[PDB]
Write a protein that binds this DNA or RNA. Structure first.
Ligand SMILES: [Mg+2]
Ligand SMILES: [Mg+2]
Ligand SMILES: [Mg+2]
Ligand SMILES: [Mn+2]
Length: 325
DNA sequence: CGGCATACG
DNA sequence: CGTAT
DNA sequence: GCCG
């Protein structure tokens, strides 16, 4: 089992679901406390389990797995022995975890904001509603739409939004294309948002494109909230006899950078962090969603596909559905 | 012990 | 500070 | 929290 998540296939569904879910609770809790290093290790350990070809049934099977030391091993041992890990349950129950989770779920609210509210004694969404002078306009949007935004988006919904985005993109810049990215591209059947990457086969034609797109969507009455290269929107999505609010991200990249932006926006988030860490630490190359830089020759790699990028970095190619780290 | 991904709004 | 993978 |  290789040490970096980008060195191994990680399928969407796997054989250690409960074990990985428990470690991810501890990862999430570490994040709420600002402990990025611990969050990372628990994320990585959970990910290793996702990559295994069968269930872990005995403690000895963790021997030699990367990212399993005393703490993560003890968590797994308790689950294997008792079906429950006391630490994990204590986290789930805690007022601090439940409130930070509730608050950070709000669009416009991050760990730092949630934590300050927690410290001020706020606990519920209605606490926030009953003091709206303290909220940014983004936070007000996130709070108004919070219920709809907590409902899973389905693949059927995604096909509907794509047609709608293509229509606007087509008027804004004929020839421009729209590609579905994020979790849906990795094969997820549900999600909490939809991500699209927009480009044009003629380098440079995509300059200034996003505002033209947004103006047209807004003119069609489809935008409940927004507001460059990235747009984080709330869209109005038709439902039988009604509609619901859905988070949609729109991103534009020039065609030269498209493989890099596709790779970055397809995720998973942990996969991309690991891929960038691998690039920098193992290959001495600097990767981002725009390109891949050799800081010794001071040159950028041209890529025509994601395949090219995996080859540049000396990694076996993984399709999106195996990037579910 | 240092490091932990790397952007844009 | 927020957002994204 | 763990790796190198
Ligand atoms: Mg939030
Ligand atoms: Mg997404
Ligand atoms: Mg997501
Ligand atoms: Mn998104």
């Amino acid at each position: 089992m290789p040490a970096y998540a980008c060195q191994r296939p990680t399928p969407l569904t796997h054989h250690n679901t409960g074990l990985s879910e428990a470690l991810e609770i501890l990862a999430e809790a570490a994040g709420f406390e600002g402990s990025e290093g611990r969050l990372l290790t628990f994320c990585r350990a959970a990910s290793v389990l996702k990559a295994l070809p069968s269930p872990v049934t005995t403690l000895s099977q963790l021997q030699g797995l990367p990212h399993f030391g005393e703490h993560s091993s003890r968590v797994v041992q308790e689950l294997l022995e008792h079906g429950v890990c006391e630490e994990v349950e204590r986290v789930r129950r805690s007022e601090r975890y439940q409130t930070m989770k509730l608050f950070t779920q709000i669009f416009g609210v991050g760990v730092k904001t949630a934590d300050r509210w927690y410290r001020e004694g706020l606990r519920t969404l209605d606490d926030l509603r009953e003091q709206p002078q303290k909220l940014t306009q983004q936070q007000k949007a996130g709070l108004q739409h919070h219920q709809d935004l907590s409902t899973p988006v389905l693949r059927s919904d995604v096909d509907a939004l794509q047609q709608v985005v293509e229509e606007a993109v087509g008027q804004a810049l004929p020839g421009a294309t729209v590609t579905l990215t994020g979790g849906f591209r990795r094969g997820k059947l549900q999600g909490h948002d939809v991500d699209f990457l927009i480009t044009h086969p003629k380098e440079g034609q995509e300059a200034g494109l996003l505002p033209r797109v947004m103006c047209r969507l807004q003119d069609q009455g489809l935008i409940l909230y927004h507001q460059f290269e990235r747009s984080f929107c709330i869209f109005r999505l038709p439902q039988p006899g009604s509609w619901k609010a859905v988070r949609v991200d729109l991103v534009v990249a020039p065609v030269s950078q498209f493989p890099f932006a596709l790779l970055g926006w397809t995720g998973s988030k942990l996969f991309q962090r690991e891929l960038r860490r691998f690039s920098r630490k193992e290959k001495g190359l600097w990767l981002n969603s725009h390109g891949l830089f050799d800081p010794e020759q001071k040159t950028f790699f041209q890529a025509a596909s994601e395949e090219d990028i995996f080859r540049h970095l000396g990694l076996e190619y993984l399709p999106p559905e195996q990037r579910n780290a």
